[PDB]
Design a protein around this motif. Structure first.
Motif, PDB file in Angstrom:
ATOM      1  N   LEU A 123       0.836  -1.063   0.015  1.00  0.00           N
ATOM      2  CA  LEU A 123       0.032  -0.172  -0.084  1.00  0.00           C
ATOM      3  C   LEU A 123       0.835   1.308  -0.099  1.00  0.00           C
ATOM      4  O   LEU A 123       0.658   2.226  -0.610  1.00  0.00           O
ATOM      5  CB  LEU A 123      -1.000  -0.057   1.138  1.00  0.00           C
ATOM      6  N   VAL A 174       2.308   2.258  -3.396  1.00  0.00           N
ATOM      7  CA  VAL A 174       1.621   2.714  -4.496  1.00  0.00           C
ATOM      8  C   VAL A 174       1.425   4.296  -4.028  1.00  0.00           C
ATOM      9  O   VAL A 174       1.238   5.355  -4.899  1.00  0.00           O
ATOM     10  CB  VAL A 174       0.212   2.234  -4.205  1.00  0.00           C
ATOM     11  N   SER A 218      -0.985   8.240  -7.255  1.00  0.00           N
ATOM     12  CA  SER A 218      -1.707   7.811  -6.378  1.00  0.00           C
ATOM     13  C   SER A 218      -2.761   8.891  -5.909  1.00  0.00           C
ATOM     14  O   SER A 218      -3.939   8.474  -5.402  1.00  0.00           O
ATOM     15  CB  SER A 218      -0.823   7.255  -5.140  1.00  0.00           C
ATOM     16  N   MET A 277      -7.447  -3.413  -3.888  1.00  0.00           N
ATOM     17  CA  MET A 277      -6.515  -2.709  -4.708  1.00  0.00           C
ATOM     18  C   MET A 277      -6.814  -2.912  -6.021  1.00  0.00           C
ATOM     19  O   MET A 277      -7.023  -1.607  -6.936  1.00  0.00           O
ATOM     20  CB  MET A 277      -5.129  -2.943  -4.216  1.00  0.00           C
ATOM     21  N   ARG A 278      -6.963  -4.102  -6.668  1.00  0.00           N
ATOM     22  CA  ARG A 278      -7.374  -4.197  -8.000  1.00  0.00           C
ATOM     23  C   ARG A 278      -8.787  -3.734  -8.456  1.00  0.00           C
ATOM     24  O   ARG A 278      -8.566  -3.033  -9.785  1.00  0.00           O
ATOM     25  CB  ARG A 278      -7.233  -5.658  -8.249  1.00  0.00           C
ATOM     26  N   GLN A 305      -2.137   0.722 -11.541  1.00  0.00           N
ATOM     27  CA  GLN A 305      -2.006  -0.518 -11.219  1.00  0.00           C
ATOM     28  C   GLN A 305      -0.782  -1.226 -11.828  1.00  0.00           C
ATOM     29  O   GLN A 305      -0.488  -2.198 -11.080  1.00  0.00           O
ATOM     30  CB  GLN A 305      -3.138  -0.877 -12.167  1.00  0.00           C
ATOM     31  N   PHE A 336       1.421  -1.022  -8.760  1.00  0.00           N
ATOM     32  CA  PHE A 336       0.715  -2.040  -7.671  1.00  0.00           C
ATOM     33  C   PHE A 336       1.272  -3.451  -7.915  1.00  0.00           C
ATOM     34  O   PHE A 336       1.824  -4.073  -7.168  1.00  0.00           O
ATOM     35  CB  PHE A 336      -0.753  -2.026  -7.707  1.00  0.00           C
TER      36      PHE A 336
END
Ligand SMILES: [Zn+2]
Ligand SMILES: [Zn+2]
Ligand SMILES: [Zn+2]
Length: 178
Positions: free
Chosen positions: A83, A86, A92, A137-138, A161, A164
């Protein structure tokens, strides 16, 4: 120590790591920088120690196995660091706070999601398996791609993404493939 926050790259009220030269704003660090604790070791240092204590933890893993892991302390920490990685990307900002959806020709997602919500969920120990955290997240990026359709702004979702997914593969030592 560095004179800017490792996450947001601004100066301010910084807390310094004792075992590395990184510094952090209080709520930029995940978890939030702990009240006392001298010395204090940041999340980068804590993750490095896990690897050093168990060098085999870097051998390749299947994603399906990683996802079904229960959120014990070490997996909790790894998702916190993922996290954080990101949030380290300036893009972000687009995904941090609660979104709203009013665009001609699109309908908002059924299940909105955003970084700060994931942050709260981790803090409150709401995820029982790594899969919970990864799914939320996705879903942030999937909701964005679906809503923005052919607007070029969809690319921001692709970009964040990719940050991530690269970090997920690094942190959880996913087996490299073509
Ligand atoms: Zn910061
Ligand atoms: Zn450190
Ligand atoms: Zn070992």
């Amino acid at each position: 120590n560095s004179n800017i926050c490792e996450v947001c790259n601004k100066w301010g009220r910084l807390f310094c790591c004792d075992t590395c030269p990184r510094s952090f704003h209080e709520h930029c660090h995940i978890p939030s920088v702990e009240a006392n604790k001298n010395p204090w070791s940041c999340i980068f240092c804590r993750i490095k120690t896990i690897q050093e204590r168990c060098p085999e933890s870097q051998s390749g893993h299947q994603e399906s196995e990683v996802l079904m892991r229960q959120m014990l302390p070490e997996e909790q920490l790894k998702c916190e660091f993922l996290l954080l990685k990101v949030y380290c990307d300036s893009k972000s900002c687009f995904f941090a706070s609660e979104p709203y959806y009013n665009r001609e020709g699109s309908q908002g997602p059924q299940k909105p999601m955003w970084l700060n919500k994931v942050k709260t969920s981790l803090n409150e120990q709401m995820y029982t398996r790594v899969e919970g955290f990864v799914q939320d997240m996705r879903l942030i990026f999937h909701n964005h791609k679906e809503f923005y359709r052919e607007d070029k702004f969809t690319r921001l979702g692709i970009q964040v993404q990719d940050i991530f997914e690269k970090n997920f593969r690094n942190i959880f030592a996913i087996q490299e493939t073509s």
